[PDB]
Symmetry: D2
Subunit: 480 residues, 4 copies
């Protein structure tokens, strides 16, 4: 029968036996050894938390919302079967994450396997399939009134979207709102965010501005374009803008911390240098690399943060280079942050250009006296796309509301109906430059290149420009 | 006398110097125990029972924290215990001038009861401070602890209200310019008063505070700027500061300007107006004052608190029947009814002198809709709310100085474009709320029609629920749909 | 009417059924906004601004949570919405009877002002409930929502006060026995009222609460015990229950019985006694009552709140000079002075009838020490405080039923010896505090000598600072050293 | 180098002196990032992801707070920056010696793997400290900041472990006696280590901490006691101290000794024992050690962390099949089954030498009941847990000195009878938990009968569920 778990974020959470069964598998328990925030623990020591607990919380919130909708509106005809499918999807959407979470799919795979297109979402689905099959979960699903054919499909669609008009098969348009819960492809407002806001804040020691419980109390389902969608009370629109403001602020302060990112980068580099020599045993004894473990779920199951220590503790001279990089992390001899800047006006930077940017910085020729001359390979340039989840688009334009005088009647609210104190744009890029040569003279030089390059490209003046490169900044009129 | 410890839920165990205790244990200060921080907000947010008293302790303590932190980081500043105590006293004493229900008193009631006079709680804080000192022989005690009342009383007053009339301050020289930035920062609004109320109001409202003042105190340094010594913030903390103001604005949107909170303020104000002629408060020499004239005698002002509300509610005098009746409608929750919200468009701005005429404009609107009842100007209330980042149209971060880690003594400026594109383009706006004093279904239905029609007439923004409440009006306007 | 949401800092967003709202929006309920939960504690713990009103919402909500949880876990209980609403109304309404400064009123002032009468805030809660219903036509609304006023009003009153006179309850049958355990558990004191105040008082005092009521609700089941259906707790949660009472006792030790908190209560009480003859409160039909007689007319009681304190403080009537003077000494913090604390020894226990004679005993002690001043009985205050786990000498866990996971429908009992040896051997005790009304150094020096001598004479426990305050006295007693 | 700021969720922004940073940025310290504070507790309390690393920062910081506060209140103490840094370093470094899964290592695994040796994490903290200093050239840096390595290294070690053998300390004189009370108080256990873990563990477990260390720091003074200068507490704070220990005991009851938490510790231990012969860790000079012998070489110990658990779990070596199999049963949550709890009666106490024989006693019990299966000693596990207030049968408040406001410089003593009758009469006890390795319904049914019978045979306390679990057995005993 049902279990109770004490979670510091949510208190006592009840788990249905079916969910317990899913949880007590190697594929799920693997998430215990994967840090939610990856390299962020190396900056924010409270951030020891792993994907496992986050996943329970997501499962629980998914349950809270679907339950609340069913209580408020019986006409929806939400079944226990629906509830469990939504919960399982909530529990299982993080299944696909790799070592150090976003470091894996954000940095390492793109560089190690550039041709392949891969996301932790893709992986969550494959791992789910693997989990089910390796553990005879299908019978248990039937025992609790689930129909594996339909429901497994439903659960996967919740995580990844349509597997291919109504494009979903797992449930009909009348249950369209169930898709908005775990992973909302329309506007990003889902229970996953709500868990991580609260859980990350509790651990980082930052405080969360967003009340998900309030939002759940005001959520209704209404008809919109012959779909039944989740609608929010009109007056809660400010709170939603704040939700995304909060999300952006958490990225600025924590998830994109300049040092957090460089640590991610260093770990990535070490993984690249270990990739040829590290072997992980997949299906039938067969052997995979860190970069190919994504092709066999049996191998992927064993790919966790542990890899980092396997490398750190290795004695194989093949891994000397990789191991050396991790040692510099332990001694805190890190690549050195040089500065930050942004593009100007319409200028935007594409992914294909990323590899050429170190070369551009090294090519800048500042009119200054330098001991050392620096090369492209000495520079790291991290480009960070900050948005409200939908590139240039405003996600509140993709949200439906209702008012208290007509609760069944969905409506739209424009930005101009809310406030003038809101953002005019919803996307931007940050450029961080770091130097792999750490000494005073290399660093002094690196700053001159950097600031010169900013001036050459008509980027924004680094905040400390006048202090670090006083001989460069005067040339640019706009800057002073 | 030696030092006392107080347990505050926001700040933990706070130490108080005997001098501060002496100031605190006076009728003038203890009066703050009977003045709600958020006034009518308690009638919407039941956790908001807190009073100005505790807020004032917290402000005093944070003032102390920041000045102490600057002195520890930089001895060369030559900050004395005398400076520390003066800053703390100013922190404790900047809320001394508040009246019943806080901002309701100076924001609503006085402007309507004594329209000719110009008055602010800041003014009052200074007069009440003067009164407190004199009525309790505090000056001797100040001397006993190494303060110089001539200079220091001036300093403390300037901290609260600004110059009492280059360098316009007398209480301290330009080398101690940064001490003025602490309790009430007239330059950019970044001060310890905000920090206390953010944390304290959030803890009570059950909303969560986004702003880390402790972090800010760790990164604060003093640097030279324009031959002044000013408090400077680490460059990379600039985002946090934008967030501080974003937080402040969000607290106003959710709580301090809650539509119902405001109407309750308004109703209490109305009741006070109707009681003003009959309520008498004994000031200096047995002389008698009204609620609206108590501000002229600090002895009378000392006795003017939230208690007035219950004095009226519990009165039996038939003179007060009308005032008393209004408070009773509050208890029964028969409140004036919110009709809707809208904003001006483009450059349009609304001045204070026009406020009285707006109910008349709404009543004059003639919507092409079937109405049982016809409504009059006096049936409508129109609240106009100026929301900003503390400096009207100005960006306060343009008035902040920073430093970088490579040159910690060298002050610098950071522009908005150097921070983010996701920041606001404007830093002030107005909200218009309309409420109706006639509560029945038909009067309310009607009121919505006038309101939306009037929005259309004035080219204001489409109320969010416009199409639902006034479906026959909204189509006429192209822009709206 | 449809349902309302209220944001509480302790519990978050609480939903209120329209019927509850209607009850809430009355003068009789709204009155609780002007009664401090902790009375004079605010004068020691400045975060404790909270009033009975918000506590009452929280109790109402928790009552709802538990009854809902039982119904979800066991449908066979047949719990109806009707039952749910009755339990919630009882939760909301059990604090209705509290007077100014809460426990100060029924604990101190009434006993001394009307010694013949027997009165408790529970009594008052019932009378005020009756009054609230009748004065506001609530009965019709109850019927509209499917309640049966005859049965249900009785049920609600029984929840608050117990049987109005076996199955001694009329409002519901033995099969719904467990509904009585929720709001005010007369059997063992484990109820949702405690759970609210633990969390709410901690949040405000700035002390941290050790007890997880949410956990307890998850584990709670109903089982048959002695042909009753009672709420049962999971066996392994027994430690948590012992901790619940430990926490309750610690909150009293640190806060509710703070020595200075208590003396302030005492000073306010004294001021009320001296004002009682001159303060008049208009009850039913214009008839006039005193502070001490307002309890006889609910219409008058409705207007009796903390406001009285300020009515006196701000009075000009020379009749009230003495009462007013006492409150002024509170504002200036010239308080009666704590002398010390001690406890009885062995079997010795002190009865209420002896309380009046104790100041006289202390004044009669004759310490072999040199004294400037000689002190009188009237100079001494002696507060006696009974600390227990809610059931005098009895252990409340002996009155709790449990279940185990292998047989969830089978109730069982757990003895102390089955839990831990580290638990208390006794569950009740008395503290004696002595204070002096003469505050000067020499009177205080003397008062300490009397006090410690008296402790020695009566074979009480050695005050913790006995050797330091009165070195010349403590040597005489062998046991002490 | 200048000072760093770290954001800790428990304590906020903590400042670190450059010297402490230097100590922290070493492999020997960074190792603590891969050792769970609560070991197997994370497998019961999913918020408890935290590691020894962050606990250590918090201890270091609180040590600093207290010593600073004493110096501010009393200059006459003559506390120097040198003293402050030494106390902080001791605070940071007292957890250095902990092994995989913390107390599981020294509480369970070593005692069973190397029974002849006597070893504690305290011993290890000292050896690891020595190793850390030497391997990283910290001594020069100590001198640079005004420390005297000869005296101060000794001082720091004495803080952690006590005298290395009248005044028995060499690192500082009797006039600075109170500095020893801070990091690890051998007199009464009131130290900053507790204060950190109370607050940190509670934050993570989702239990709430009853004890206000900040308050205690405000009221702490130094007074003369028996020609020593000792830390004294304000008289009226005595209740808070009793509550401190009550809180400590309640944390053990709820969390640190959770029945399932403990069985998981036991299972991990068992797996480590079965792996001990085959796992090799490279120590000094390429030399090879076992899990159980790594404690003899700090270079090897540095590499011994929670990672071992995954090294075994992911192993393919058939030598480790048995060890690996145990960890897999943990992942599937096929755990040994808790049977019940009981305590000894009266004066009866159980010694460590008898522990091995208890499974045999339970198996020897012969209940008058019908059984399908007969169970053996090896099928039973018996955990014995000694609960106290930190000083066996002794009351630690009897070893605390107080002062009063009237005479602040005058130390005094307070007896229990001067405080309350509602306090405990005893300050120590034992708990016995019995578990069964055979998990099926019939084995478990049987195990309960043995257990309860055995309790009756030994005149132990009646298990709380005795009547439900073993109704036939329970009636024979009159007392029950
Ligand atoms: N006293 C407590 N207070 C708070 N949390 C607790 C307490 N005891 C245990 N927990 C946590 C640890 C677990 O995450 C969760 C459930 O544990 P627990 O109730 O002990 O379940 P269990 O599975 O060990 O017992 P059983 O299987 O006998 O029902 O609650
Ligand atoms: N046990 C406690 N835990 C937490 N806070 C407390 C406790 N006792 C008192 N406080 C709070 C209440 C007050 O705001 C503040 C000062 O209390 P306290 O130290 O009792 O001052 P006091 O003036 O009564 O004692 P004294 O004057 O004897 O030193 O600390
Ligand atoms: N944005 C917010 N965040 C948190 N709490 C809020 C917010 N807005 C209001 N509250 C609080 C104040 C109240 O205690 C409770 C209900 O308020 P609110 O949702 O504003 O109801 P309302 O009665 O004013 O609106 P309506 O009657 O139009 O639904 O929530
Ligand atoms: N905005 C923030 N709010 C709260 N904590 C933060 C914030 N940004 C960073 N932190 C945390 C992460 C670290 O634990 C700690 C210090 O980080 P930070 O001040 O960025 O130092 P840094 O070393 O990266 O910058 P620098 O070396 O330039 O001073 O505070
Ligand atoms: Mg997502
Ligand atoms: Mg005192
Ligand atoms: Mg201001
Ligand atoms: Mg009770
Ligand atoms: Mg740095
Ligand atoms: Mg210890």
């Amino acid at each position: 029968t049902m279990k109770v778990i004490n979670d510091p974020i949510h208190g006592h959470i009840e788990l249905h036996p079916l969910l317990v069964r899913i949880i007590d598998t190697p594929q799920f328990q693997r998430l215990r050894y994967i840090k939610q925030l990856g390299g962020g623990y190396y900056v924010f020591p409270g951030a020891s938390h792993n994907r496992f607990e986050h996943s329970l919380g997501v499962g629980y919130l998914a349950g809270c919302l679907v339950h609340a909708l069913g209580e408020k509106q019986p006409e929806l005809q939400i079944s226990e079967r629906d509830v469990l499918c939504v919960q399982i999807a909530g529990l299982c959407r993080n299944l696909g994450h790799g070592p150090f979470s976003h470091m894996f799919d954000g940095r390492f795979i793109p560089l190690a396997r550039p041709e392949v297109k891969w996301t932790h979402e893709q992986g969550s689905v494959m791992m789910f399939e693997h989990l089910i099959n390796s553990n005879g979960i299908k019978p248990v699903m039937e025992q609790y009134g689930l129909i594996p054919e339909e429901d497994i499909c439903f659960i996967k669609e919740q995580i990844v979207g349509p597997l291919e008009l109504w494009p979903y098969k797992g449930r009909p348009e009348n249950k369209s709102f169930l898709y908005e819960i775990v992973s909302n492809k329309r506007n990003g407002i889902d229970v996953d965010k709500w868990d991580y806001f609260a859980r990350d804040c509790h651990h980082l020691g930052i405080q969360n501005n967003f009340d998900y419980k309030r939002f759940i109390k005001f959520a209704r389902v209404c008809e919109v374009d012959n779909e039944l969608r989740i609608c929010a009370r009109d007056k809660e629109v400010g709170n939603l803008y704040d939700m995304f403001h909060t999300r952006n602020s958490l990225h600025r302060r924590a998830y994109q911390h300049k040092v957090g990112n460089i640590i991610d980068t260093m770990i990535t580099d070490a993984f690249l240098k270990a990739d040829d020599y590290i072997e992980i045993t997949g299906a039938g004894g067969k052997k995979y690399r860190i970069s190919t473990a994504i092709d066999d779920m049996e191998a992927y199951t064993k790919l966790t943060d542990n890899i980092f220590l396997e490398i750190l503790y290795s004695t194989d001279p093949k891994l000397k280079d990789a191991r050396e990089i991790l040692k510099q992390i332990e001694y805190r001899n890190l690549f050195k942050y040089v500065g930050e800047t942004q593009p100007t006006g319409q200028i935007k930077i594409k992914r294909e250009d990323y590899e050429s940017l170190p070369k551009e910085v090294a090519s800048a020729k500042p009119k200054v006296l330098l001991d050392v001359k620096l090369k492209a390979e000495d520079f790291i340039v991290d480009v960070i796309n900050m948005d409200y989840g939908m590139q240039e688009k405003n996600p509140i334009d993709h949200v439906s509301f209702y008012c208290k005088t007509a609760p069944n009647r969905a409506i739209r609210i424009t930005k101009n109906q809310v406030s003038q104190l809101l953002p005019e744009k919803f996307a931007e890029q940050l450029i961080r430059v770091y130097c792999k040569k750490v000494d005073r003279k290399s660093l002094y030089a690196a700053r001159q290149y950097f600031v010169q390059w900013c001036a050459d490209r008509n980027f924004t003046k680094p905040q400390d420009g006048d202090v670090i490169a006083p001989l460069i900044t005067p040339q640019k009129k706009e800057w002073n």
